[PDB]
Design a protein around this ligand. Structure first.
Ligand code: A1ADA
Ligand code: A1ADA
Ligand code: CL
Ligand code: CL
Lengths: 123, 4, 123, 4
């Protein structure tokens, strides 16, 4: 086509979606990870994760307001990944990299799994 | 704005 | 912080949100523009437009599944702007620039209004 | 991935 493009548009959209999350505006699901609860937007979860994409395209699960993750999933690993989904920023540290990689493999977040594998290979 |  | 960043993350998120829109997945509102109807995600509309942000943060309007725009709004201008919201790409043409600018001013999409003003000033 |  003959379209023009606004370079910062996608980043600005994601920044506003994170502002809505921080104010709990139009969040439509709670993700339960052990004792911890995380509110989010189903569309953002689907856009970032192969697991949530499969869950919320399911004709029955698409209507659930509560999703319980596998008890092996670490709440801190999930929190770091949820922050990444809404910001593009990953808080990857020596003390959390194993839990982050395991959570990203479960959530099917291919690019995160790739950087964790590379950071582990280096050490 | 750019030409993509 | 000591975060790493995935450059293409925001663009990939927006691409997936547009894929959900094209398949009518988790759309939660219909925007009525004269005789024309446009399905969308309230969160994406809020993230892109000062008008939708104000509408869906309203304690009563946040629950509406149908929003009717001012009858002066042109459906083609709205369609071009809705496509821009989900892609960062604006189909700005000599034949639509006046309707696009008027719709962007109504929707409170500051960056679109700015490029329309610049393109009109050049001609 | 980059250092932002
Ligand atoms: C694959 N597909 C057509 C599609 N459409 C819409 C959405 Cl929201 C979506 N999201 C999704 C699926 C798989 C994966 C991701 C997002 C991230 C990932 O690593 N794998 N994937
Ligand atoms: C201003 N603010 C705190 C905020 N938080 C969340 C959202 Cl979704 C939002 N969106 C929004 C508001 C105003 C405008 C836009 C989006 C685009 C624009 O030109 N003006 N604005
Ligand atoms: Cl990823
Ligand atoms: Cl804009």
């Amino acid at each position: 086509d003959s379209c023009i493009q606004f370079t910062r548009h996608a980043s600005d959209v994601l920044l506003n979606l994170n502002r809505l999350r921080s104010r709990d505006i139009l969040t439509d699901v709670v993700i339960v990870v052990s004792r911890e609860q995380f509110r989010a937007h189903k569309t953002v979860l689907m856009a970032c994760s192969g697991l949530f994409y499969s869950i919320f395209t399911d004709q029955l699960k698409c209507n659930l307001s509560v999703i319980n993750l596998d008890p092996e999933i670490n709440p801190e690993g999930f929190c770091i990944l949820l922050d990444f989904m809404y910001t593009s920023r990953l808080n990857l540290r020596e003390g959390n990299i194993m839990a982050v990689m395991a959570t990203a493999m479960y959530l099917q977040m291919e690019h995160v799994v790739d950087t964790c594998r590379k950071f582990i290979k280096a050490s | 704005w750019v030409i993509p």
